Amino acid sequence: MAMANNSSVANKVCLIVIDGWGVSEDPYGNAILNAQTPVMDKLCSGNWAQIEAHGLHVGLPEGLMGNSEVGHLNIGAGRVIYQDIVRINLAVKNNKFVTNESLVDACDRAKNGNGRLHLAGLVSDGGVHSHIDHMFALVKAIKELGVPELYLHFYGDGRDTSPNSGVGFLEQTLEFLEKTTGYGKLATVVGRYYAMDRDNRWERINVAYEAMIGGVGETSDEAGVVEVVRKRYAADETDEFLKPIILQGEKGRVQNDDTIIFFDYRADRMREISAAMGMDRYKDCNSKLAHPSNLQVYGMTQYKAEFPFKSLFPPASNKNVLAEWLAEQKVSQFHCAETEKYAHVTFFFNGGLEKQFEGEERCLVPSPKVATYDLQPEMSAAGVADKMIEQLEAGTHPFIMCNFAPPDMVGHTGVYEAAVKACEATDIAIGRIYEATQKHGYSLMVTADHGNAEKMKAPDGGKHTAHTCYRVPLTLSHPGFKFVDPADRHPALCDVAPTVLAIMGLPQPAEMTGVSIVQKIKLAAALEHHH
């Protein structure tokens, strides 16, 4: 089970990832603070750190709580794993559209053809399928690239935003196109119920299709379109269900030889309209209008493997996550979790794929077969520690890691008293592991993938069952290292694996763009600091 370079490791490391254990100073409904956790009370003192596990720090949209899949992905990868909204928002901030290869291709086609380009997508700040800022940036870039004509097909939201917020986004859009860029024309408004169907209800898609290719709908212009929407509002027709509104007449329709960019980043609700325009699914619409010839369609992301469309943001890769890299260094490793989080210490920790690397030994501890986990809040934490202690007493693997599920899965039941017991059981397990690590020459690091159990009561005293935005601990028993935050940002989950490799005396692969957040210090200086 060993690997050839095990004897080159400077420090063996045991990494405990507690699931759903965050750092909150508010004791109300705080199952971690109120639980008896004498082990974590000591580990989380002196030289320890509090690192970010939510929102932009882990590649999630700003303000969004962490989660087990993203958390284990970021911990295992040693880099920020960007979700699409964050990656595209950064490209907007950094003016990266104007040099985007697929966008430049689309703009070249229009300039070498009939000069006509279309943008189509959900216009709101919801951030779930699209962002209005993305569309504004595309307009700016397409102007800078000198496309003669740009037409916008505005899909109404009211689902990821309030049902009457479309008027505002419409007002913002009109002012933007007229005053800010003085370029581009709004051509269609239609609700996402029609344009963004994902249930193969092609009679819905046809309403959007015929609006874009044939102006089927209510005619309007820049001066009156907002009042039309207000009229629909008064008739109980909200953004999601806006029947089409047609501007610019025939000039703004999708015509023969035109170019189309769909700017939604999420695939499920673009597969249909994009394939109707760019492939053969216009047939399903059974329209009395002919399909325009020689169209070419581009997407913000890849909507389906088998679609031919170029994408502005193709899928990213994650080479040399920690588990891959340890194997490449010929260092063996051990991953352990109970059933409910076994995928997270394998599939997600290892980069989001079913791959076990060379030298990677795994251990699955069965979760208890109970109706809900508040009935056995300790879950199988004891058996996870048992397996880890076996590995520490053997000393075979220089890197071992486990997950402890109780705080998150009991936290999800909303039962505060059960969560307190889940945290007490986790603390006991961590203490038994800690004793073994100190006996057998392992440095112990404890972290979490995101918070949960520290906030068990909602503001009305009811159950709180969700993940949180609180920081998570990062501990280290090795006295020869001091935690140091990155120079330009808060520490985050992406920094755990670079830190482990630095402690292990192993190289850090170029692909891990996280930073190590420890510095070596002399033992005498460390001891004098504490006193």
Partner: peptide, 13 residues
């Protein structure tokens, strides 16, 4: 939150 329950902004858990 608003991303319920997309993989992996907000998976079922």
């Amino acid at each position: 939150x608003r991303y319920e329950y997309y993989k992996y902004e907000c998976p079922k858990c």
